[PDB]
Design a protein around this ligand. Structure first.
Ligand SMILES: OC[C@H]1O[C@@H](O)[C@H](O)[C@@H](O)[C@@H]1O
Ligand SMILES: OC[C@H]1O[C@@H](O)[C@H](O)[C@@H](O)[C@@H]1O
Ligand SMILES: [Ca+2]
Length: 351
Protein backbone atom coordinates (compact mmCIF):
# COMPACT_ATOMS: atom_id res chain seq x y z
CA UNK A 1 0.00 0.00 0.00
CA UNK A 2 2.79 2.46 0.91
CA UNK A 3 4.62 0.82 -2.03
CA UNK A 4 1.58 1.20 -4.30
CA UNK A 5 1.22 4.85 -3.30
CA UNK A 6 4.93 5.57 -3.67
CA UNK A 7 5.39 4.03 -7.14
CA UNK A 8 2.23 5.74 -8.43
CA UNK A 9 3.34 9.16 -7.13
CA UNK A 10 6.78 8.54 -8.62
CA UNK A 11 5.48 7.28 -11.97
CA UNK A 12 2.95 10.14 -12.27
CA UNK A 13 5.29 12.94 -11.14
CA UNK A 14 6.79 13.67 -14.62
CA UNK A 15 3.24 14.00 -16.00
CA UNK A 16 2.20 16.22 -13.08
CA UNK A 17 5.18 18.52 -13.70
CA UNK A 18 4.37 18.60 -17.44
CA UNK A 19 0.80 19.61 -16.59
CA UNK A 20 2.02 22.08 -13.97
CA UNK A 21 4.27 23.70 -16.61
CA UNK A 22 1.30 23.95 -19.03
CA UNK A 23 -0.95 25.30 -16.25
CA UNK A 24 1.62 27.86 -15.17
CA UNK A 25 2.18 29.23 -18.69
CA UNK A 26 -1.62 29.41 -18.94
CA UNK A 27 -1.71 31.23 -15.61
CA UNK A 28 0.88 33.76 -16.79
CA UNK A 29 -1.09 34.27 -19.99
CA UNK A 30 -4.37 34.47 -18.04
CA UNK A 31 -2.97 37.14 -15.71
CA UNK A 32 -1.92 39.43 -18.57
CA UNK A 33 -5.40 38.93 -20.03
CA UNK A 34 -7.01 39.47 -16.64
CA UNK A 35 -5.08 42.68 -16.03
CA UNK A 36 -6.04 44.01 -19.44
CA UNK A 37 -9.73 43.13 -18.96
CA UNK A 38 -9.68 44.51 -15.48
CA UNK A 39 -8.09 47.77 -16.60
CA UNK A 40 -10.68 48.11 -19.39
CA UNK A 41 -13.56 47.29 -17.07
CA UNK A 42 -12.42 49.72 -14.44
CA UNK A 43 -12.01 52.49 -17.06
CA UNK A 44 -15.43 51.68 -18.41
CA UNK A 45 -17.03 51.75 -14.94
CA UNK A 46 -15.29 55.11 -14.37
CA UNK A 47 -16.53 56.53 -17.68
CA UNK A 48 -20.09 55.46 -16.93
CA UNK A 49 -19.86 56.74 -13.35
CA UNK A 50 -18.30 60.08 -14.27
CA UNK A 51 -20.22 60.68 -17.48
CA UNK A 52 -17.23 60.66 -19.79
CA UNK A 53 -17.90 60.24 -23.54
CA UNK A 54 -17.62 56.42 -23.50
CA UNK A 55 -20.17 56.18 -20.69
CA UNK A 56 -22.80 57.12 -23.28
CA UNK A 57 -22.97 53.40 -24.09
CA UNK A 58 -24.87 52.85 -20.81
CA UNK A 59 -26.12 56.43 -20.19
CA UNK A 60 -27.41 57.51 -23.59
CA UNK A 61 -28.68 54.26 -25.10
CA UNK A 62 -32.28 54.60 -26.13
CA UNK A 63 -32.08 52.03 -28.91
CA UNK A 64 -33.04 48.41 -28.35
CA UNK A 65 -32.23 46.68 -31.56
CA UNK A 66 -30.59 43.37 -30.82
CA UNK A 67 -32.71 40.36 -31.80
CA UNK A 68 -35.27 40.28 -34.58
CA UNK A 69 -35.66 36.63 -35.41
CA UNK A 70 -39.07 37.00 -37.04
CA UNK A 71 -38.09 39.76 -39.43
CA UNK A 72 -38.94 39.39 -43.08
CA UNK A 73 -37.24 40.92 -46.11
CA UNK A 74 -38.39 43.07 -48.93
CA UNK A 75 -35.50 43.77 -51.29
CA UNK A 76 -35.22 46.42 -54.03
CA UNK A 77 -32.35 46.82 -56.45
CA UNK A 78 -30.88 43.35 -56.44
CA UNK A 79 -30.58 41.89 -59.94
CA UNK A 80 -28.51 38.77 -59.22
CA UNK A 81 -29.87 36.40 -56.65
CA UNK A 82 -27.91 33.28 -55.93
CA UNK A 83 -29.96 30.28 -56.99
CA UNK A 84 -30.99 27.81 -54.31
CA UNK A 85 -29.12 25.15 -56.23
CA UNK A 86 -25.92 27.22 -56.10
CA UNK A 87 -26.49 28.04 -52.43
CA UNK A 88 -26.94 24.32 -51.80
CA UNK A 89 -23.89 23.43 -53.89
CA UNK A 90 -21.68 25.76 -51.85
CA UNK A 91 -23.25 25.14 -48.39
CA UNK A 92 -20.70 22.43 -47.44
CA UNK A 93 -17.77 24.55 -48.62
CA UNK A 94 -15.54 26.27 -46.08
CA UNK A 95 -16.47 29.98 -45.49
CA UNK A 96 -13.60 31.30 -47.60
CA UNK A 97 -14.45 29.05 -50.54
CA UNK A 98 -18.17 29.89 -50.09
CA UNK A 99 -17.25 33.54 -50.80
CA UNK A 100 -14.76 32.83 -53.49
CA UNK A 101 -16.57 34.56 -56.32
CA UNK A 102 -14.35 32.75 -58.85
CA UNK A 103 -16.29 29.53 -57.98
CA UNK A 104 -19.60 30.98 -59.13
CA UNK A 105 -20.66 31.56 -62.72
CA UNK A 106 -23.57 33.45 -64.28
CA UNK A 107 -25.76 30.31 -64.21
CA UNK A 108 -25.58 30.45 -60.41
CA UNK A 109 -27.60 33.67 -60.38
CA UNK A 110 -31.06 34.68 -61.38
CA UNK A 111 -32.88 37.95 -61.59
CA UNK A 112 -35.91 36.58 -59.83
CA UNK A 113 -35.62 36.22 -56.09
CA UNK A 114 -35.96 32.52 -55.18
CA UNK A 115 -35.83 33.22 -51.40
CA UNK A 116 -38.87 33.53 -49.27
CA UNK A 117 -39.08 36.97 -47.51
CA UNK A 118 -38.73 35.11 -44.22
CA UNK A 119 -35.35 33.59 -44.98
CA UNK A 120 -31.78 34.72 -45.36
CA UNK A 121 -31.23 35.72 -48.93
CA UNK A 122 -28.16 35.38 -51.07
CA UNK A 123 -27.25 37.68 -53.91
CA UNK A 124 -24.44 39.29 -55.77
CA UNK A 125 -24.07 42.98 -55.19
CA UNK A 126 -22.69 45.09 -57.95
CA UNK A 127 -20.39 48.07 -57.42
CA UNK A 128 -22.25 51.35 -57.40
CA UNK A 129 -25.75 49.95 -57.34
CA UNK A 130 -27.67 50.85 -54.19
CA UNK A 131 -30.03 48.22 -52.83
CA UNK A 132 -32.77 48.88 -50.36
CA UNK A 133 -33.84 46.24 -47.85
CA UNK A 134 -36.95 46.68 -45.84
CA UNK A 135 -37.28 44.46 -42.77
CA UNK A 136 -40.61 44.21 -41.15
CA UNK A 137 -42.20 41.99 -38.50
CA UNK A 138 -40.02 43.76 -35.97
CA UNK A 139 -41.07 42.53 -32.57
CA UNK A 140 -38.45 43.34 -29.91
CA UNK A 141 -37.10 46.74 -30.90
CA UNK A 142 -37.57 50.30 -29.87
CA UNK A 143 -35.94 53.66 -29.87
CA UNK A 144 -36.63 56.03 -26.98
CA UNK A 145 -39.78 54.09 -26.23
CA UNK A 146 -41.03 54.26 -29.83
CA UNK A 147 -41.67 50.73 -30.86
CA UNK A 148 -39.88 50.07 -34.14
CA UNK A 149 -42.22 48.59 -36.79
CA UNK A 150 -39.89 48.39 -39.71
CA UNK A 151 -36.29 48.94 -40.60
CA UNK A 152 -34.90 49.99 -43.93
CA UNK A 153 -31.29 49.51 -44.76
CA UNK A 154 -29.71 50.77 -47.90
CA UNK A 155 -26.53 49.13 -48.98
CA UNK A 156 -24.16 50.17 -51.67
CA UNK A 157 -21.12 48.19 -52.72
CA UNK A 158 -18.41 50.79 -53.48
CA UNK A 159 -15.65 48.44 -54.37
CA UNK A 160 -14.69 44.85 -54.29
CA UNK A 161 -11.57 42.82 -53.98
CA UNK A 162 -12.48 40.89 -57.11
CA UNK A 163 -12.14 42.07 -60.72
CA UNK A 164 -15.83 41.77 -61.47
CA UNK A 165 -17.09 44.77 -59.39
CA UNK A 166 -19.13 42.38 -57.34
CA UNK A 167 -19.41 40.65 -54.04
CA UNK A 168 -21.49 37.78 -52.77
CA UNK A 169 -23.85 38.66 -49.97
CA UNK A 170 -25.69 36.60 -47.42
CA UNK A 171 -28.31 39.02 -46.28
CA UNK A 172 -29.80 37.95 -42.95
CA UNK A 173 -33.54 38.28 -42.67
CA UNK A 174 -32.77 39.52 -39.14
CA UNK A 175 -31.49 43.08 -39.75
CA UNK A 176 -29.50 43.00 -36.42
CA UNK A 177 -27.29 40.36 -38.07
CA UNK A 178 -26.96 42.60 -41.10
CA UNK A 179 -24.74 41.26 -43.88
CA UNK A 180 -22.08 38.66 -44.52
CA UNK A 181 -20.23 39.75 -47.65
CA UNK A 182 -17.23 38.50 -49.50
CA UNK A 183 -15.42 38.12 -52.75
CA UNK A 184 -12.28 36.62 -54.15
CA UNK A 185 -9.20 38.74 -53.65
CA UNK A 186 -8.30 38.73 -57.31
CA UNK A 187 -5.21 40.92 -57.16
CA UNK A 188 -1.93 40.97 -55.34
CA UNK A 189 -0.70 43.90 -53.23
CA UNK A 190 -3.35 44.03 -50.51
CA UNK A 191 -4.83 47.32 -51.57
CA UNK A 192 -8.27 46.33 -52.80
CA UNK A 193 -11.20 46.31 -50.51
CA UNK A 194 -14.83 45.48 -50.18
CA UNK A 195 -16.52 48.64 -49.17
CA UNK A 196 -20.18 48.98 -48.43
CA UNK A 197 -22.00 52.10 -47.53
CA UNK A 198 -25.09 51.67 -45.54
CA UNK A 199 -27.76 53.67 -43.97
CA UNK A 200 -30.33 52.41 -41.50
CA UNK A 201 -33.72 53.95 -41.06
CA UNK A 202 -36.01 52.93 -38.27
CA UNK A 203 -39.76 53.42 -38.51
CA UNK A 204 -42.27 53.89 -35.74
CA UNK A 205 -45.61 52.11 -35.47
CA UNK A 206 -47.27 54.79 -37.58
CA UNK A 207 -44.77 54.11 -40.35
CA UNK A 208 -42.84 57.35 -39.88
CA UNK A 209 -39.10 57.45 -39.90
CA UNK A 210 -37.70 57.93 -36.41
CA UNK A 211 -35.67 61.02 -35.78
CA UNK A 212 -32.37 59.97 -34.20
CA UNK A 213 -31.27 63.54 -33.38
CA UNK A 214 -31.63 62.90 -29.65
CA UNK A 215 -28.39 60.99 -30.12
CA UNK A 216 -29.67 57.96 -28.26
CA UNK A 217 -29.01 55.37 -30.93
CA UNK A 218 -25.82 53.78 -29.82
CA UNK A 219 -24.83 51.11 -32.26
CA UNK A 220 -22.18 48.49 -32.12
CA UNK A 221 -19.29 48.35 -34.57
CA UNK A 222 -17.89 45.09 -33.20
CA UNK A 223 -15.46 42.58 -34.55
CA UNK A 224 -13.22 44.97 -36.42
CA UNK A 225 -10.47 42.40 -36.94
CA UNK A 226 -7.01 43.29 -38.01
CA UNK A 227 -4.77 40.35 -38.63
CA UNK A 228 -1.39 40.35 -40.22
CA UNK A 229 0.00 37.02 -41.41
CA UNK A 230 1.85 35.81 -44.46
CA UNK A 231 -1.63 35.60 -46.09
CA UNK A 232 -2.61 39.22 -45.64
CA UNK A 233 -2.77 42.43 -43.74
CA UNK A 234 -6.50 42.13 -43.27
CA UNK A 235 -8.14 45.16 -41.73
CA UNK A 236 -11.79 45.90 -41.15
CA UNK A 237 -12.65 49.56 -41.00
CA UNK A 238 -15.69 51.74 -40.60
CA UNK A 239 -15.97 55.25 -41.85
CA UNK A 240 -18.55 56.74 -39.59
CA UNK A 241 -19.37 59.69 -41.88
CA UNK A 242 -21.47 62.13 -39.89
CA UNK A 243 -22.14 59.58 -37.09
CA UNK A 244 -20.10 59.86 -33.92
CA UNK A 245 -17.45 57.47 -32.74
CA UNK A 246 -17.82 56.09 -29.27
CA UNK A 247 -14.53 54.64 -28.08
CA UNK A 248 -14.68 51.39 -26.14
CA UNK A 249 -12.16 51.45 -23.24
CA UNK A 250 -9.42 48.95 -23.70
CA UNK A 251 -10.45 48.37 -27.32
CA UNK A 252 -7.84 47.90 -30.02
CA UNK A 253 -10.20 50.00 -32.18
CA UNK A 254 -9.66 53.75 -32.37
CA UNK A 255 -10.30 56.72 -34.63
CA UNK A 256 -7.82 57.29 -37.44
CA UNK A 257 -9.18 60.23 -39.44
CA UNK A 258 -12.92 59.56 -39.78
CA UNK A 259 -12.29 55.78 -39.98
CA UNK A 260 -12.24 53.47 -37.00
CA UNK A 261 -10.17 50.35 -36.90
CA UNK A 262 -7.41 48.60 -35.03
CA UNK A 263 -4.19 50.16 -36.24
CA UNK A 264 -2.27 47.06 -35.10
CA UNK A 265 -2.99 43.32 -35.23
CA UNK A 266 -5.73 42.50 -32.70
CA UNK A 267 -6.19 38.89 -33.79
CA UNK A 268 -3.01 37.07 -32.64
CA UNK A 269 -1.14 37.47 -29.38
CA UNK A 270 1.83 36.25 -31.42
CA UNK A 271 1.46 39.57 -33.32
CA UNK A 272 1.07 41.72 -30.20
CA UNK A 273 -2.67 41.34 -29.59
CA UNK A 274 -3.84 41.35 -26.01
CA UNK A 275 -6.29 38.52 -26.73
CA UNK A 276 -6.49 35.89 -29.42
CA UNK A 277 -9.44 36.37 -31.72
CA UNK A 278 -9.65 32.78 -32.94
CA UNK A 279 -11.21 29.70 -31.40
CA UNK A 280 -14.27 29.07 -29.25
CA UNK A 281 -12.86 31.34 -26.46
CA UNK A 282 -11.12 33.93 -28.62
CA UNK A 283 -12.47 37.47 -28.34
CA UNK A 284 -14.12 37.25 -31.75
CA UNK A 285 -16.06 34.03 -31.03
CA UNK A 286 -19.74 34.32 -31.96
CA UNK A 287 -22.88 32.23 -31.87
CA UNK A 288 -24.80 31.43 -35.07
CA UNK A 289 -27.00 34.44 -34.14
CA UNK A 290 -23.90 36.69 -34.38
CA UNK A 291 -23.91 37.30 -30.62
CA UNK A 292 -20.34 37.31 -29.13
CA UNK A 293 -19.41 34.23 -27.04
CA UNK A 294 -16.59 36.16 -25.35
CA UNK A 295 -16.39 38.70 -22.51
CA UNK A 296 -13.40 40.09 -24.35
CA UNK A 297 -15.40 41.02 -27.53
CA UNK A 298 -14.88 44.72 -26.53
CA UNK A 299 -11.28 44.35 -27.60
CA UNK A 300 -12.09 44.37 -31.36
CA UNK A 301 -15.06 46.70 -30.98
CA UNK A 302 -16.09 50.22 -31.39
CA UNK A 303 -19.41 51.91 -31.26
CA UNK A 304 -21.14 54.88 -32.65
CA UNK A 305 -23.84 57.31 -31.85
CA UNK A 306 -25.79 56.60 -34.98
CA UNK A 307 -27.40 59.82 -36.28
CA UNK A 308 -29.24 58.27 -39.18
CA UNK A 309 -26.55 59.11 -41.73
CA UNK A 310 -24.65 56.83 -44.03
CA UNK A 311 -21.54 55.05 -42.93
CA UNK A 312 -19.22 52.72 -44.73
CA UNK A 313 -17.47 49.55 -43.73
CA UNK A 314 -14.48 48.25 -45.53
CA UNK A 315 -12.37 45.16 -45.43
CA UNK A 316 -9.28 44.45 -47.36
CA UNK A 317 -5.65 43.56 -47.20
CA UNK A 318 -5.78 39.84 -48.00
CA UNK A 319 -3.22 38.41 -50.32
CA UNK A 320 -4.26 37.38 -53.76
CA UNK A 321 -6.49 34.26 -53.86
CA UNK A 322 -7.52 34.45 -50.25
CA UNK A 323 -11.15 35.55 -50.42
CA UNK A 324 -12.04 38.62 -48.48
CA UNK A 325 -15.02 38.28 -46.17
CA UNK A 326 -16.66 40.21 -43.40
CA UNK A 327 -19.71 39.63 -41.32
CA UNK A 328 -20.63 43.17 -40.58
CA UNK A 329 -23.45 43.57 -38.12
CA UNK A 330 -24.50 46.67 -36.30
CA UNK A 331 -27.16 46.68 -33.65
CA UNK A 332 -27.61 47.97 -30.11
CA UNK A 333 -25.45 45.21 -28.55
CA UNK A 334 -22.37 47.29 -27.89
CA UNK A 335 -19.42 45.17 -26.83
CA UNK A 336 -18.14 46.78 -23.66
CA UNK A 337 -15.55 45.54 -21.20
CA UNK A 338 -17.08 43.23 -18.59
CA UNK A 339 -16.21 42.09 -15.06
CA UNK A 340 -13.33 39.67 -15.48
CA UNK A 341 -13.99 38.12 -12.02
CA UNK A 342 -11.25 36.99 -9.65
CA UNK A 343 -7.57 37.41 -10.55
CA UNK A 344 -6.41 33.96 -11.72
CA UNK A 345 -4.30 32.22 -9.07
CA UNK A 346 -1.19 30.19 -9.87
CA UNK A 347 -1.62 26.41 -10.01
CA UNK A 348 -0.47 24.29 -7.08
CA UNK A 349 3.13 23.12 -7.58
CA UNK A 350 3.01 19.32 -7.47
CA UNK A 351 5.51 18.01 -4.85
O1 LIG B 1 -18.94 43.49 -36.60
C1 LIG B 1 -20.03 42.69 -37.01
C2 LIG B 1 -20.30 41.39 -36.29
O2 LIG B 1 -19.37 40.39 -36.70
C3 LIG B 1 -19.74 39.08 -36.25
O3 LIG B 1 -18.52 38.40 -35.91
C4 LIG B 1 -20.72 39.11 -35.05
O4 LIG B 1 -22.10 39.07 -35.51
C5 LIG B 1 -20.50 40.28 -34.07
O5 LIG B 1 -19.38 40.07 -33.18
C6 LIG B 1 -20.28 41.61 -34.78
O6 LIG B 1 -21.29 42.56 -34.40
O1 LIG C 1 -12.29 36.12 -36.57
C1 LIG C 1 -13.46 35.93 -37.45
C2 LIG C 1 -13.80 37.22 -38.22
O2 LIG C 1 -13.53 37.03 -39.61
C3 LIG C 1 -13.52 38.25 -40.38
O3 LIG C 1 -13.14 37.98 -41.74
C4 LIG C 1 -14.90 38.89 -40.34
O4 LIG C 1 -14.81 40.31 -40.34
C5 LIG C 1 -15.48 38.94 -38.98
O5 LIG C 1 -16.80 39.56 -38.99
C6 LIG C 1 -15.24 37.77 -38.08
O6 LIG C 1 -15.29 38.69 -37.01
CA1 LIG D 1 -15.09 40.82 -38.03
Amino acid sequence: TAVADYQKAKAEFPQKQEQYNKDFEKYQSDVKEYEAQKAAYEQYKKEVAQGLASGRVEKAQGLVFINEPEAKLSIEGVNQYLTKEARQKHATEDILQQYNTDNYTASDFTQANPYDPKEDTWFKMKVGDQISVTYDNIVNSKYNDKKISKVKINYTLNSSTNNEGSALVNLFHDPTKTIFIGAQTSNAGRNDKISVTMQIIFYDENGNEIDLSGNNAIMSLSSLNHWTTKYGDHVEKVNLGDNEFVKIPGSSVDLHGNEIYSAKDNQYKANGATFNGDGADGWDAVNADGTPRAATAYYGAGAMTYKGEPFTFTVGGNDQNLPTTIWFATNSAVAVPKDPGAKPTPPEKPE
